[PDB]
Amino acid sequence: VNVPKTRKTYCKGKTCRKHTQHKVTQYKAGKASLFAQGKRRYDRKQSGFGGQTKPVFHKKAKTTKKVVLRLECVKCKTRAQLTLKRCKHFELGGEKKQKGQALQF
Amino acid sequence: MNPVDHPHGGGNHQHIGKASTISRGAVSGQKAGLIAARRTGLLRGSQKT
Amino acid sequence: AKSKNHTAHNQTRKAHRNGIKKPKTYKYPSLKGVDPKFRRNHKHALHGTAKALA
RNA sequence: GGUUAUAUGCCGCCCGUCUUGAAACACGGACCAAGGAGUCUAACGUCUAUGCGAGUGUUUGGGUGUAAAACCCAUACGCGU
RNA sequence: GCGGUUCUGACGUGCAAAUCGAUCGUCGAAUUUGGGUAUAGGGGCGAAAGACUAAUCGAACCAUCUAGUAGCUGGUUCCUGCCGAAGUUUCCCUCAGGAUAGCAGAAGCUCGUAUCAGUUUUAUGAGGUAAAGCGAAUGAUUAGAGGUUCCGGGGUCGAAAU
RNA sequence: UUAGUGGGCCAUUUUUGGUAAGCAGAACUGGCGAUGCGGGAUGAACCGAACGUAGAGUUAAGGUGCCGGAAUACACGCUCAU
RNA sequence: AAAACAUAGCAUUGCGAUGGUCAGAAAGUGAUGUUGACGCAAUGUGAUUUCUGCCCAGUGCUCUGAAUGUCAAAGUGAAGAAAUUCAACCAAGCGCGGGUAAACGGCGGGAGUAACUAUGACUCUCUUAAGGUAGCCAAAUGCCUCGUCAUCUAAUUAGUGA
RNA sequence: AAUCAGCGGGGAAAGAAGACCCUGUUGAGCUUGACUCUAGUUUGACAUUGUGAAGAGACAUUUAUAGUU
RNA sequence: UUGAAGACAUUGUCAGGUGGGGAGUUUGGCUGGGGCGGCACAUCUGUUAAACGAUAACGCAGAUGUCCUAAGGGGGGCUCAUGGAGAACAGAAAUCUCCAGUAGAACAAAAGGGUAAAAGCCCCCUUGAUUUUGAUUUUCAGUGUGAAUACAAACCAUGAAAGUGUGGCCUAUCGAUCCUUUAGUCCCUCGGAAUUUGAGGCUAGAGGUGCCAGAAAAGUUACCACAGGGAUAACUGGCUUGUGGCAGUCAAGCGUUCAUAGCGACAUUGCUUUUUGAUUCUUCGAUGUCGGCUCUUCCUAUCAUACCGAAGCAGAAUUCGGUAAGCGUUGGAUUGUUCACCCACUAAUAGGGAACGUGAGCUGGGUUUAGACCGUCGUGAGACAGGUUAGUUUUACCCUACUGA
Ligand SMILES: C[C@@H]1C[C@@H]([C@H](O)CC2CC(=O)NC(=O)C2)C(=O)[C@@H](C)C1
Ligand SMILES: [K+]
Ligand SMILES: [K+]
Ligand SMILES: [K+]
Ligand SMILES: [K+]
Ligand SMILES: [K+]
Ligand SMILES: [K+]
Ligand SMILES: [K+]
Ligand SMILES: [K+]
Ligand SMILES: [K+]
Ligand SMILES: [K+]
Ligand SMILES: [K+]
Ligand SMILES: [K+]
Ligand SMILES: [K+]
Ligand SMILES: [K+]
Ligand SMILES: [K+]
Ligand SMILES: [K+]
Ligand SMILES: [K+]
Ligand SMILES: [K+]
Ligand SMILES: [K+]
Ligand SMILES: [K+]
Ligand SMILES: [K+]
Ligand SMILES: [K+]
Ligand SMILES: [K+]
Ligand SMILES: [K+]
Ligand SMILES: [K+]
Ligand SMILES: [K+]
Ligand SMILES: [K+]
Ligand SMILES: [K+]
Ligand SMILES: [K+]
Ligand SMILES: [K+]
Ligand SMILES: [K+]
Ligand SMILES: [K+]
Ligand SMILES: [K+]
Ligand SMILES: [K+]
Ligand SMILES: [Mg+2]
Ligand SMILES: [Mg+2]
Ligand SMILES: [Mg+2]
Ligand SMILES: [Mg+2]
Ligand SMILES: [Mg+2]
Ligand SMILES: [Mg+2]
Ligand SMILES: [Mg+2]
Ligand SMILES: [Mg+2]
Ligand SMILES: [Mg+2]
Ligand SMILES: [Mg+2]
Ligand SMILES: [Mg+2]
Ligand SMILES: [Mg+2]
Ligand SMILES: [Mg+2]
Ligand SMILES: [Mg+2]
Ligand SMILES: [Mg+2]
Ligand SMILES: [Mg+2]
Ligand SMILES: [Mg+2]
Ligand SMILES: [Mg+2]
Ligand SMILES: [Mg+2]
Ligand SMILES: [Mg+2]
Ligand SMILES: [Mg+2]
Ligand SMILES: [Mg+2]
Ligand SMILES: [Mg+2]
Ligand SMILES: [Mg+2]
Ligand SMILES: [Mg+2]
Ligand SMILES: [Mg+2]
Ligand SMILES: [Mg+2]
Ligand SMILES: [Mg+2]
Ligand SMILES: [Mg+2]
Ligand SMILES: [Mg+2]
Ligand SMILES: [Mg+2]
Ligand SMILES: [Mg+2]
Ligand SMILES: [Mg+2]
Ligand SMILES: [Mg+2]
Ligand SMILES: [Mg+2]
Ligand SMILES: [Mg+2]
Ligand SMILES: [Mg+2]
Ligand SMILES: [Mg+2]
Ligand SMILES: [Mg+2]
Ligand SMILES: [Mg+2]
Ligand SMILES: [Mg+2]
Ligand SMILES: [Mg+2]
Ligand SMILES: [Mg+2]
Ligand SMILES: [Mg+2]
Ligand SMILES: [Mg+2]
Ligand SMILES: [Mg+2]
Ligand SMILES: [Mg+2]
Ligand SMILES: [Mg+2]
Ligand SMILES: [Mg+2]
Ligand SMILES: [Mg+2]
Ligand SMILES: [Mg+2]
Ligand SMILES: [Mg+2]
Ligand SMILES: [Mg+2]
Ligand SMILES: [Mg+2]
Ligand SMILES: [Mg+2]
Ligand SMILES: [Mg+2]
Ligand SMILES: [Mg+2]
Ligand SMILES: [Mg+2]
Ligand SMILES: [Mg+2]
Ligand SMILES: [Mg+2]
Ligand SMILES: [Mg+2]
Ligand SMILES: [Mg+2]
Ligand SMILES: [Mg+2]
Ligand SMILES: [Mg+2]
Ligand SMILES: [Mg+2]
Ligand SMILES: [Mg+2]
Ligand SMILES: [Mg+2]
Ligand SMILES: [Mg+2]
Ligand SMILES: [Mg+2]
Ligand SMILES: [Mg+2]
Ligand SMILES: [Mg+2]
Ligand SMILES: [Mg+2]
Ligand SMILES: [Mg+2]
Ligand SMILES: [Mg+2]
Ligand SMILES: [Mg+2]
Ligand SMILES: [Zn+2]
């Protein structure tokens, strides 16, 4: 799937509340902090004897992730997120489809 | 012997079943066979330096 | 071992013991799912009729 | 007329159990006595009775006593408002 | 003396929780054996059978934790009266089990001939099963008949010929 | 508000798999399970009919040679099987 | 009670004591050891005779082998008010590379080709390391199978030889 | 009626809550390239821990800088 | 005291590696037993399905874990499959033209439905595939998830406009709690008081659980254990009779000639329970599990013997058939065998049943516990309806039956 690098869509920002132009990127998770309370608790639980104290997932099934778009408004800089359906190939501002061309050998 | 008694024990034929060469870093109960062997098999030649 | 999978045998007999009750009707049903634009006005209309029979 | 034993006519498989289905060629039971299995507690739901009622609950404790009883009680605290 | 092959003998509620008879292996050593002594339970000891470790061994015995847990088996003690089921729904490492809804009892409460009803009638909808159809669409299928190839092919003239 | 239950099974009709099955699986109803009683010799489910204790009458389904309560009844035919 | 175990014989492995193998909760602690390679420890095979093929890709074991892959804690540097963050450095091990089958083990398939046909010494091929050598065989190892031939018998799923 | 010696057809005779098989969210003996650990062992760091040298390398193609490993 | 050794080593603490030697644990489910296989486990289309809805089976034929900035949204113009007749090279098939053409095309992907100045084809403009939360339909407990429907309040797109548009013409295309992470408010909290970092909250997403309402998980046991199961396999028995076995009917042919002496194709009706399946009703607090030996009795579908009919019956030998189960039906080699096979005798060497008769009647060769060897398989423990060798066969004195007393 191919989606354009810009998109005019609604902006929730209090100085907009109207359709504005947005830059479109893909969302990437973010580095897990060592001081997030869950990480600190896990570290305490894992210390000492007793081995692995929490489940470890093994039974992977999916071969895709949902794509999320980060839309940044070009006026106010407010951001929004949009989830696409599952897909195997994703590109952002790819070359558009030409109709009615000879498929080369 | 039976498995309870020796690493080599057991089996529906008598056989070792894993390499008989054992690491120098193996622990008591594992060091049976040829410990830390540089080579094995019939020595074709003279052993003198 | 294998067992029975499904049947509705005996289910209508069970249903008819405490009968199949028709759902019971009121003057004044809920205005629930009625168009909000209509409802919003209708409040204002009913307000005025009170302030008039007074 | 009752009771009881017997006779006669007709009828009447061995109980208990699990089970769709037991008289079963399913299981327990030779016999008899005595023992032998839904209890108490903490905290709760519905319902009912009783007291008092925007309150209610004396019993931690104190007072008293014919002494583990009965009788009396301040401040809190609990639940409710 | 030590052993324990065969009879698959006796016996098999025994003489005996391993015996008896005959037959048999070995009989100067890797021999047999008394006493002393060492090795102790995930331990010992093993010319190795998971053998032996006090009639206990693929982990002894004793006490305790311990009335260990059991979706599994068995049992569960007086009388009469009235009402009276389910084996189905959904979810569950669910399929010999639960939760859930249903069916059932009890307690009633608000009223008092309604609102009702495993029923008919009248009116008015919906339905694509039974039947039917295939000289109607799709698909299958028997037979001739007529017609046509600016072309399919066998027969034979035919320069070649729509 | 709370119990039990959450193995079902059979018959008629509709019905799938299967050569078929007292086989496996569905549909609607009635049953058995939970239920005795009269009948079908016998039998969970068929037919009749559902049950307080008694008396009398009448019947259901099934019967009336004898066993066995009830016509070796009446009537028209058919049938003789080493 | 045996064809199993042991056995002599054979072969391999480790170790020169600051040691190998093994013990202990620990120890100014132990076994081997009153020992010292013709020894102690760990394995395999199983008298003599005769022989003991090929494969180091895998798993293992092993190496004064390359290094700049991976790479802990402490330490170091930078940023920051600091908690901290980031980086560089970075032991052994892993990875990379060599050795080793009396280490665990492995030892396939197709096509063509000789002057009767047949067969294929010979040749070409595919294949994950290599492609079963010497021998031996319907063997206590062969499904098909009571294999085929011979012998043994009147007759043999038996026996023996092939 | 009451019975004696025999006998092994039957009592699906007796002996043991089937060892086979399945089920149980019941085990245990054993194995491994299962999950999770662990004695031991090995490697580094700090401590035990004091006192001296000398070279050879690294840090802001050769070759000079000052400090620090 | 004397040698060695020396700030190394040793010892202590922490860190990385190694570590079935050892410890603990796990090693789904459904299922015509279980296992192997499959997925009927989350789903979608058509049919089964009995014309409302619901509806099973490891029923039938198929599909899903995607794909798309257009293949989404709006508007415009146009018309498809196919066939016919024409046009240099050009032919069955190239491109152009006319006529016919109810969809026989296309619409991402299964199948069904839907669609013609369109929902198809081409072109133009776009981001309604957006924001805020509620209601509703399906599945249903009337929970969740998914999917979908109609509005509201905004902001937009398109179009002259009415309108249409909250992703894909409709019916599938997917995911809790905890944790992490992002967006939003730049808001609440850090509880002696402040500021700034950090952490924690509130609202909306993503990271995934396919066993799809969502454990973190490998084997073996013939050394085996326990709770149970006839809810479930391995005998008999029962239902069934495909398969096996036996018998009919028809008569095209065969039989020198001649359908039927004897046979008999294509068809087709049955019987039997001496085959083997199918099933799972009985038995898992146990009905002793192959074969032989012994012994009795029964069936007849008759091998022999008696008496007969028929013949392609001259005789002799034989063949087909009837009444017949009265009477017999064997000795051996090999194999545990059942079965088979051969030698031989014979009047004849028929077939079967009785819990696949018969183990408190035997035996124990086979099978089928524990020992052991081999081969193949397996890294291994171990497996083998493969071969091989060794492996405790218990009790009657009761009742009946029977034999005698
Ligand atoms: C696989 C990863 C983790 C997983 C999840 O946090 C696992 C948890 C779930 C839970 O409630 N308790 C636990 O202890 C484990 C999740 O959400 C995924 C998207 C991302
Ligand atoms: K072994
Ligand atoms: K089941
Ligand atoms: K079922
Ligand atoms: K009397
Ligand atoms: K029972
Ligand atoms: K029994
Ligand atoms: K141990
Ligand atoms: K003892
Ligand atoms: K123990
Ligand atoms: K259960
Ligand atoms: K019609
Ligand atoms: K038609
Ligand atoms: K209930
Ligand atoms: K329930
Ligand atoms: K009844
Ligand atoms: K009856
Ligand atoms: K009646
Ligand atoms: K009689
Ligand atoms: K060896
Ligand atoms: K190799
Ligand atoms: K190697
Ligand atoms: K054990
Ligand atoms: K030191
Ligand atoms: K360690
Ligand atoms: K280990
Ligand atoms: K099966
Ligand atoms: K829903
Ligand atoms: K599940
Ligand atoms: K296990
Ligand atoms: K048949
Ligand atoms: K059975
Ligand atoms: K049984
Ligand atoms: K004879
Ligand atoms: K023996
Ligand atoms: Mg800590
Ligand atoms: Mg730790
Ligand atoms: Mg072991
Ligand atoms: Mg063995
Ligand atoms: Mg090993
Ligand atoms: Mg059920
Ligand atoms: Mg099902
Ligand atoms: Mg009298
Ligand atoms: Mg009677
Ligand atoms: Mg039963
Ligand atoms: Mg009973
Ligand atoms: Mg019976
Ligand atoms: Mg029982
Ligand atoms: Mg008894
Ligand atoms: Mg008793
Ligand atoms: Mg008593
Ligand atoms: Mg003796
Ligand atoms: Mg004996
Ligand atoms: Mg005796
Ligand atoms: Mg053994
Ligand atoms: Mg108890
Ligand atoms: Mg107990
Ligand atoms: Mg009643
Ligand atoms: Mg679950
Ligand atoms: Mg039960
Ligand atoms: Mg139709
Ligand atoms: Mg239909
Ligand atoms: Mg029809
Ligand atoms: Mg309950
Ligand atoms: Mg259930
Ligand atoms: Mg149940
Ligand atoms: Mg059944
Ligand atoms: Mg019942
Ligand atoms: Mg009758
Ligand atoms: Mg009479
Ligand atoms: Mg012996
Ligand atoms: Mg030996
Ligand atoms: Mg030798
Ligand atoms: Mg570090
Ligand atoms: Mg290194
Ligand atoms: Mg092997
Ligand atoms: Mg050869
Ligand atoms: Mg051979
Ligand atoms: Mg052989
Ligand atoms: Mg031979
Ligand atoms: Mg012989
Ligand atoms: Mg032979
Ligand atoms: Mg008897
Ligand atoms: Mg006797
Ligand atoms: Mg049992
Ligand atoms: Mg077993
Ligand atoms: Mg379960
Ligand atoms: Mg265990
Ligand atoms: Mg283990
Ligand atoms: Mg299962
Ligand atoms: Mg479901
Ligand atoms: Mg319908
Ligand atoms: Mg479209
Ligand atoms: Mg709902
Ligand atoms: Mg869905
Ligand atoms: Mg504070
Ligand atoms: Mg689920
Ligand atoms: Mg059964
Ligand atoms: Mg019994
Ligand atoms: Mg018995
Ligand atoms: Mg018996
Ligand atoms: Mg006859
Ligand atoms: Mg039979
Ligand atoms: Mg028998
Ligand atoms: Mg016996
Ligand atoms: Mg027998
Ligand atoms: Mg017997
Ligand atoms: Mg035997
Ligand atoms: Mg054995
Ligand atoms: Mg006597
Ligand atoms: Zn903005």
Short mmCIF file of N, CA and C (backbone and C1' of nucleotides) in Angstrom, two decimals, chain I residues 68 72 114 137 180 182-183 222 295 352 362 369:
data_model
loop_
_atom_site.label_atom_id
_atom_site.label_comp_id
_atom_site.label_asym_id
_atom_site.label_seq_id
_atom_site.Cartn_x
_atom_site.Cartn_y
_atom_site.Cartn_z
P C I 68 -1.32 -3.68 -2.34
"O5'" C I 68 -2.51 -2.70 -2.73
"C5'" C I 68 -2.91 -2.55 -4.11
"C4'" C I 68 -4.06 -1.58 -4.18
"C3'" C I 68 -3.85 -0.23 -3.51
"O3'" C I 68 -3.18 0.66 -4.38
"C1'" C I 68 -5.95 -1.08 -2.91
P G I 72 -12.62 2.05 -5.55
"O5'" G I 72 -12.58 2.91 -4.20
"C5'" G I 72 -12.77 2.22 -2.93
"C4'" G I 72 -12.82 3.22 -1.81
"C3'" G I 72 -13.72 4.43 -2.00
"O3'" G I 72 -15.05 4.15 -1.63
"C1'" G I 72 -11.62 5.15 -1.39
P G I 114 -29.98 -10.71 -7.92
"O5'" G I 114 -29.31 -9.30 -7.71
"C5'" G I 114 -29.78 -8.44 -6.68
"C4'" G I 114 -28.95 -7.18 -6.69
"C3'" G I 114 -28.78 -6.50 -8.05
"O3'" G I 114 -29.90 -5.72 -8.40
"C1'" G I 114 -26.69 -6.70 -7.03
P U I 137 -31.19 -3.47 18.18
"O5'" U I 137 -30.58 -3.86 16.75
"C5'" U I 137 -31.46 -4.16 15.66
"C4'" U I 137 -30.69 -4.77 14.53
"C3'" U I 137 -29.98 -6.09 14.80
"O3'" U I 137 -30.88 -7.17 14.65
"C1'" U I 137 -28.49 -4.62 13.72
P U I 180 4.89 0.13 32.07
"O5'" U I 180 5.66 0.32 30.69
"C5'" U I 180 6.81 -0.44 30.39
"C4'" U I 180 7.00 -0.44 28.90
"C3'" U I 180 6.80 0.89 28.16
"O3'" U I 180 7.98 1.68 28.12
"C1'" U I 180 5.61 -0.81 27.04
P U I 182 7.22 7.33 23.97
"O5'" U I 182 6.00 7.57 22.98
"C5'" U I 182 6.24 7.87 21.60
"C4'" U I 182 4.93 7.94 20.86
"C3'" U I 182 4.06 9.17 21.13
"O3'" U I 182 4.55 10.30 20.43
"C1'" U I 182 2.72 7.24 21.09
P A I 183 4.27 11.80 20.96
"O5'" A I 183 2.70 11.98 20.68
"C5'" A I 183 2.25 12.15 19.33
"C4'" A I 183 0.76 12.23 19.31
"C3'" A I 183 0.12 13.27 20.24
"O3'" A I 183 0.15 14.54 19.63
"C1'" A I 183 -1.00 11.24 20.50
P A I 222 5.45 -49.71 28.89
"O5'" A I 222 5.91 -51.23 29.15
"C5'" A I 222 6.60 -51.56 30.39
"C4'" A I 222 7.94 -52.25 30.15
"C3'" A I 222 8.87 -51.69 29.08
"O3'" A I 222 10.25 -51.95 29.31
"C1'" A I 222 8.02 -53.80 28.41
P C I 295 -10.64 -90.27 23.36
"O5'" C I 295 -12.04 -89.56 23.64
"C5'" C I 295 -12.72 -89.92 24.84
"C4'" C I 295 -13.84 -88.96 25.09
"C3'" C I 295 -14.87 -88.90 23.96
"O3'" C I 295 -15.75 -89.99 24.09
"C1'" C I 295 -14.35 -86.73 24.64
P G I 352 -14.54 -76.84 7.19
"O5'" G I 352 -15.94 -76.32 7.76
"C5'" G I 352 -16.13 -76.24 9.18
"C4'" G I 352 -17.59 -75.99 9.42
"C3'" G I 352 -17.99 -75.98 10.89
"O3'" G I 352 -17.43 -74.84 11.47
"C1'" G I 352 -19.50 -77.30 9.71
P C I 362 -6.01 -78.55 33.80
"O5'" C I 362 -5.01 -79.49 32.97
"C5'" C I 362 -4.44 -80.71 33.53
"C4'" C I 362 -3.69 -81.45 32.45
"C3'" C I 362 -2.47 -80.78 31.81
"O3'" C I 362 -1.34 -81.00 32.63
"C1'" C I 362 -3.94 -81.52 30.11
P U I 369 5.69 -61.52 27.23
"O5'" U I 369 5.41 -60.55 28.46
"C5'" U I 369 5.04 -59.17 28.22
"C4'" U I 369 5.38 -58.37 29.45
"C3'" U I 369 6.85 -58.43 29.84
"O3'" U I 369 7.60 -57.54 29.03
"C1'" U I 369 5.52 -58.81 31.76
#
